[PDB]
Design an enzyme around this catalytic site. Structure first.
Site, PDB file in Angstrom:
ATOM      1  N   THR A  58       0.949  -8.450   4.235  1.00  0.00           N
ATOM      2  CA  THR A  58       2.282  -8.199   3.701  1.00  0.00           C
ATOM      3  C   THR A  58       3.355  -8.736   4.636  1.00  0.00           C
ATOM      4  O   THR A  58       4.262  -9.457   4.206  1.00  0.00           O
ATOM      5  CB  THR A  58       2.482  -6.703   3.481  1.00  0.00           C
ATOM      6  N   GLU A  93      27.396 -14.176  17.836  1.00  0.00           N
ATOM      7  CA  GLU A  93      27.440 -14.742  19.179  1.00  0.00           C
ATOM      8  C   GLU A  93      26.061 -15.196  19.640  1.00  0.00           C
ATOM      9  O   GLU A  93      25.920 -16.272  20.231  1.00  0.00           O
ATOM     10  CB  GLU A  93      27.982 -13.709  20.157  1.00  0.00           C
ATOM     11  N   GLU A 145       0.844  -1.186   0.000  1.00  0.00           N
ATOM     12  CA  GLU A 145       0.000   0.000   0.000  1.00  0.00           C
ATOM     13  C   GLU A 145       0.881   1.237   0.000  1.00  0.00           C
ATOM     14  O   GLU A 145       1.809   1.326   0.814  1.00  0.00           O
ATOM     15  CB  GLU A 145      -0.912   0.012   1.222  1.00  0.00           C
TER      16      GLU A 145
END
Ligand SMILES: Nc1nc2c(ncn2[C@@H]2O[C@H](COP(=O)(O)OP(=O)(O)OP(=O)(O)O)[C@@H](O)[C@H]2O)c(=O)[nH]1
Ligand SMILES: Nc1nc2c(ncn2[C@@H]2O[C@H](COP(=O)(O)OP(=O)(O)OP(=O)(O)O)[C@@H](O)[C@H]2O)c(=O)[nH]1
Ligand SMILES: Nc1nc2c(ncn2[C@@H]2O[C@H](COP(=O)(O)OP(=O)(O)O)[C@@H](O)[C@H]2O)c(=O)[nH]1
Ligand SMILES: Nc1nc2c(ncn2[C@@H]2O[C@H](COP(=O)(O)OP(=O)(O)O)[C@@H](O)[C@H]2O)c(=O)[nH]1
Lengths: 50, 419, 411, 426
Positions: free
Chosen positions: C119, C228, C45
């Protein structure tokens, strides 16, 4: 009924917590006893080596 | 004449080594610019052992440590060609730091150290400062030790290695690194001086009585130990004892080369002028069990051998009655089938600021406690294969951890056996 | 040492509107890891993207980086995965390639999405799939927003959450859960904002992100990079979902009165009343914790604080991990944003741990998803968009496997 | 050669020793920084008995301050000659006992005594030939009495061959500060009779009497009382520190004054002590020193020896004195008041002279009299102890801590047989 079931369960959980706290005291002091007592064993060990 | 080459690996190794060259360069009177400004001429005679550009090789896998090295003082004194330096970073993965990233940095660190080794005439040995918990320090440094012994088998080798402790535990994979690092150390290093942060924090609490012991002071303590151990080469004495003579006097059996270290004198700022400096007083601080720099109380076992390196104008007679008294008094704490378990040495040059110093190196049998203290944590994690895939998917298999376990297990067995 | 950040959906790029405001303000060579920014906003959009194009940061962002589609995903995973995603995703990754090409020492990608939408769920999963094919070895930090149990804005968000997590297992390497209801409760309790909006939420999310990347931007006493977390916090390849917390989230009035030190903030980072996910870590057993420290902190007290935690008994640890911590100390103090509702602090702590309380969240979500799916409610919308009846049940059984995995490892 | 270590316990003990180390360091000519600045070499040859040279003219006192409250130690270090003690010797708890002999002997003792013993062991093995130990404490408090007495017991199990002095103030009915004084005094004395070598009893009642009549002070704070006590204590151990015409060391004085092993509670005095008004109107001769010594009103305990009989007595003189005049004056005061002296021991007084008077004076003296009137004090305290225990007042603060009723019956029995046997030898 549920409002009072909750109070009995809370009582049971606290009865366990004060128990858990007491168990830590037993754990700690027993560790201290090992340190002092193994020192005693070393002293007797030293006595026999001499 | 007799030469010592320096090698610093990993973040821990680099900051320890940075403080080391600060102290040594100060002792030799060389400014942070690199020019001599000292007073006595005894220092110029034996400055080839370490130099004026230092004879060091820094090596790691992250630019932050190199940038922090050149930023501080005595950072403009290293030769920029000795900053052999990778770019990606292992990051607390022994397999990455020993098989993946090492496999392409190791060729370059070996070239610079070979040029720095053949540059002199007669090597005394190498001196490696690293850790056993991290990946790019332990694993890469460990592989460097193995490569060096293949090229230079008749030369000595020092490893100032810190070990992880459950009280002072940085990462989660500490035992996976410590066990494997020991598996290579027991067959490669000549001798190792075991350190750990728990005993170091404990020393700075009780004896130094410091409020905020940052990493600068811990690295300062380890640096004073390393300066004290090689004073015999750099300065004349009434009884000289180089590196080789300490090794042959301390190691009765070829697998017993993990030493505990202490240092004297160590006093708080408040009690600094309220104290005396005598040989008996230093001996009571030497043989104190709360002054060792490992988390292994030596009074829980026996001593095999011990040594004390003294610096300052001393009377050798005092040395002998103190060493014999400590042996005749506490006869149970010492092994019986070796008489006169104490080696001694004197050098006439004290460290800058003190009149009389001492360095203790004790080969005790209380070391098997810490190694069992490690194998416990390793045993539980390995049993359900926790964190194993980050190592296995790199080339390591399961029998390697079992092999390191067996080496850990039979080492503490022979410590118990000789006990 | 560079890391690029992509922002997906209405929630992702609004979070980004807070993240980049903080980054540029913080940097006014250390800036090289972020700076034009190394970002791509992308959405289907154009209304929220053009808010960025007409905003104050019109000149900061390169024009092409702002990606905007032509029509919405209609809160359908299927629509945002198979119909409309197929046109925008190719343009997105064709940009990420040459941004990574400009970089040299790329640590990894980090993605921002909400799994309740179309989305964020659909093309967010699609984008992560193609990135795993193209790079694979590079770390992908996924900061997702799962839907809360009782606070909800949608109806079909169970469908999207299950259907998104199914791919979120084998694509992202590090996944951080952030609900909205929990953060609402945080801003009400500690920050005492009785009426919070999305802006306040997105502001303190940016504070968390900046705290775990500050080890790269600035040198610390004990630095900890992006690899890490990959190693020290993920004991098994299928358990990567991490609780997050930050301290001190304190208002200006309270902070000055309080004496902030390492021990009390290390405690505050472990109570369930200050976590970014509505879950009860007391219900679970910790596997491994990671502690990020910023500011005036020496290694002593961080070690002292961690010792007190391990000896307390209101929180229990797993048996397979006795040394369950990974600490990290950095010198730079946390920065503030003018208008932000947080006060300046000498030192802050961000905790990222892993437990089995998350195993409770997935069962709670599965029940709601299960109820609607049995009578095929709302299924016909997704099926028309291109999906079928098969993948709902197969995604259901994948979450079932995950529930069993948490119950077995905790044993 | 012969060595004395110093031990100060509790609040009262800390201030007594503080004025003590100021006075002694003054006698040796050491400035509050800790450096030598003396003039002759009579002072330098015998500073090993108390001090240790540290580095380049730094002399540190061989003392150990031990207590349970931070303020008490802090006060000594704020004032002058506080910066001379080695900080390691500041053995120091954190919680507090608070006038509870049980807390001072069973609760907080069990976790601090080991640490102070380590300091005492290091301080004992730092020297070559031990002469004895020197302990200052009270008998009414809990952190001084109970903890200090257990310290005494630990030493007797460690070093049973060495000497031991304890300077202890006792609570009196007329000077009675706290409420649990009898429950502390009875148990402390009980432990003292089985562990201490000899005890020199002091009390606050006699201290107030001296400061009104003889000293004529206007505001006699504790600094001046401790000034008296420090001058007296220095007078006992002058003979180890300085040479004289007739030396009398501590063990020599103990065997001369203790006729029976349980009879080791001594009364003290000191001479000369005058107001600044009458200082100008008298002289310094042996008669003026002896009459002020043997005066009952000048004793440093609230037990009139003229209510009993002197068993043995000793006098340590200081200054350039003639031993002929010494014994003739001592003999005269023993012949006139013959009834106050025991019959089956002739010449009940041991005497010694030292040739170095204290700074500011030409001639001083110190009296240590093992009398029999001390049985009045134990009766005067024991009746208060018995009065409470008959109906169990305050009992539960000890009973709930680990002592039983049999411990109190034991304590009363030992006091009772002690008073009975003192009365027998009377
Ligand atoms: N933290 C935070 N969450 C947001 C914000 N905006 C929306 N959300 C969350 O996003 C979820 C709803 O899905 P959306 O993000 O709106 O869907 P989308 O990404 O716009 O995808 P489409 O709407 O289909 O185009 C809910 O969990 C909302 O609470 C925001 O600004 N901050
Ligand atoms: N004529 C004379 N006799 C002295 C002198 N000094 C001490 N005495 C005598 O010594 C006797 C006691 O013996 P001391 O010599 O003092 O002591 P000791 O013999 O060493 O025995 P200890 O006291 O145990 O050391 C006393 O009776 C004194 O009469 C002196 O200077 N001249
Ligand atoms: N004494 C000391 N120890 C350090 C220092 N820096 C890190 N360490 C220790 O090293 C361990 C981590 O090793 P690390 O630096 O990550 O190794 P590397 O990643 O392979 O370079 C921690 O357990 C620390 O206790 C330091 O400056 N001094
Ligand atoms: N002579 C003298 N007596 C003191 C001094 N301070 C306290 N006292 C006495 O000590 C008694 C109380 O003992 P206390 O100090 O509580 O002993 P502690 O708490 O066990 O160390 C009181 O009767 C005081 O008379 C002092 O500086 N000099």
């Amino acid at each position: 009924l549920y409002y009072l079931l909750g109070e009995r369960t809370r009582r049971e959980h606290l009865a366990m917590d004060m128990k858990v706290r007491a168990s830590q005291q037993l754990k700690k002091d027993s560790a201290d006893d090992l340190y002092t007592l193994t020192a005693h064993f070393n002293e007797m060990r030293a006595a026999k080596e001499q | 004449m007799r030469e010592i080459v320096h090698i610093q690996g990993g973040q821990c190794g680099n900051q320890i080594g940075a403080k080391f060259w600060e102290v040594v360069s100060d002792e030799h009177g060389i400014d942070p610019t690199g020019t001599y400004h000292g007073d006595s001429d005894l220092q110029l005679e034996r400055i080839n052992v370490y130099f004026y550009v230092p004879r060091a090789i820094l090596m790691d896998l992250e630019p932050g440590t190199m940038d922090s090295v050149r930023s501080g003082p005595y950072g403009q004194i290293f030769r920029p060609d000795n900053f052999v330096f990778g770019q990606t970073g292992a990051g607390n993965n022994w397999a990455k730091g020993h098989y993946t990233e090492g496999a392409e940095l190791i060729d370059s660190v070996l070239d610079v150290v070979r040029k720095e080794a053949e540059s002199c005439d007669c090597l005394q040995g190498f001196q490696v400062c690293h850790s056993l918990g991290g990946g790019t320090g332990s694993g890469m440094g460990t592989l460097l030790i193995s490569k060096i012994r293949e090229e230079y088998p008749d030369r000595m080798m020092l490893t100032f290695s810190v070990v992880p402790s459950p009280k002072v535990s940085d990462t989660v994979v500490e035992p996976y690194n410590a066990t494997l690092s020991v598996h290579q150390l027991v067959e490669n290093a000549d001798e190792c001086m075991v350190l750990d942060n728990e005993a170091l924090y404990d020393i700075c609490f009780r004896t130094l009585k410091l409020t905020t012991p940052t990493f600068g002071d811990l690295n300062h303590l380890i640096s004073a130990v390393m300066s004290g151990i090689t004073c015999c080469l750099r300065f004349p004495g009434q009884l000289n004892a180089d590196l080789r003579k300490l090794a042959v006097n301390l190691i009765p059996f070829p697998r017993l080369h993990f030493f505990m270290v202490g240092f004297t004198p160590l006093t708080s700022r408040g009690s600094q002028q309220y104290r005396a400096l005598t040989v008996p007083e230093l001996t009571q601080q030497m043989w104190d069990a709360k002054n060792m720099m490992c988390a292994a109380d030596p009074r829980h076992g026996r001593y095999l051998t011990a040594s004390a390196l003294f610096r300052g104008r001393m009377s050798t007679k005092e040395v002998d009655e103190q060493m014999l008294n400590v042996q005749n008094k506490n006869s149970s704490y010492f092994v019986e089938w070796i008489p006169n378990n104490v080696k001694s040495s004197v050098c006439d040059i004290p460290p800058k600021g003190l009149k009389m110093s001492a360095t203790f190196i004790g080969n005790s049998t209380a070391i098997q406690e810490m190694f069992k203290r490690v194998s416990e944590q390793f045993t539980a994690m390995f049993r359900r294969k926790a964190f194993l895939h980050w190592y296995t998917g790199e080339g390591m298999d399961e029998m390697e951890f079992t092999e390191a376990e067996s080496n850990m297990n039979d080492l503490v067995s022979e410590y118990q056996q000789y006990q | 040492r560079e890391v690029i950040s992509i922002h997906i959906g209405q929630a992702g790029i609004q979070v980004g509107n807070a993240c980049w405001e903080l980054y540029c303000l913080e940097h006014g060579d250390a800036f090289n890891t972020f700076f034009v920014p190394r970002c791509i906003f992308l959405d289907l959009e154009p209304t929220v993207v053009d808010e960025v194009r007409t905003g104050t940061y019109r000149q900061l962002f390169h024009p092409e980086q702002l990606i905007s589609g032509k029509e919405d995903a209609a809160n359908n995973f299927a629509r945002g995965h198979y119909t409309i995603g197929k046109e925008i995703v190719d343009l997105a990754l064709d940009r990420i390639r040459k941004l990574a090409d400009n970089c040299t020492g790329l640590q990894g990608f980090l993605v921002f999405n909400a799994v309740g939408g179309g989305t964020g769920s659909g093309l967010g999963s699609l984008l992560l799939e193609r990135l795993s094919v193209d790079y694979g070895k590079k770390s992908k930090l996924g900061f997702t927003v799962y839907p809360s149990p009782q606070v909800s804005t949608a109806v079909v968000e169970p469908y999207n959450s299950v259907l998104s997590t199914h791919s979120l297992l084998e694509h992202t390497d590090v996944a951080v859960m952030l609900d909205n209801e929990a953060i609402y409760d945080i801003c009400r309790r500690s920050l005492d904002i009785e009426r919070p909006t999305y802006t306040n939420l997105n502001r303190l999310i940016a504070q968390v992100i900046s705290s775990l990347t500050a080890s790269l931007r600035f040198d610390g006493a004990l630095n900890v990079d992006i690899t890490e977390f990959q190693t020290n916090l993920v004991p098994y390849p299928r358990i990567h979902f991490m609780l997050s917390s930050y301290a001190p989230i304190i208002s200006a009035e309270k902070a000055y009165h309080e004496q902030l030190s390492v021990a009390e903030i290390t405690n505050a980072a472990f109570e369930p009343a200050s976590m970014m996910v509505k879950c009860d870590p007391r219900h679970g057993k910790y596997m491994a914790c990671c502690l990020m420290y910023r500011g005036d902190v020496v290694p002593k007290d961080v070690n002292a604080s961690v010792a007190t935690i391990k000896t307390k008994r209101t929180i229990q640890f797993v048996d397979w991990c006795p040394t369950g911590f990974k600490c990290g100390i950095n010198y730079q103090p946390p920065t503030v944003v003018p208008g932000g509702d947080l006060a300046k602090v000498q030192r802050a702590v961000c905790m990222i741990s892993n437990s089995t309380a998350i195993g409770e969240i997935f069962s709670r979500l599965d029940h709601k998803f299960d109820l609607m799916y049995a009578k095929r409610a709302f299924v016909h919308w997704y099926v028309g968009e291109g999906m079928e009846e098969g993948e709902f049940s197969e995604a259901r059984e994948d979450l079932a496997a995950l529930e069993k995995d948490f119950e077995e490892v905790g044993a």
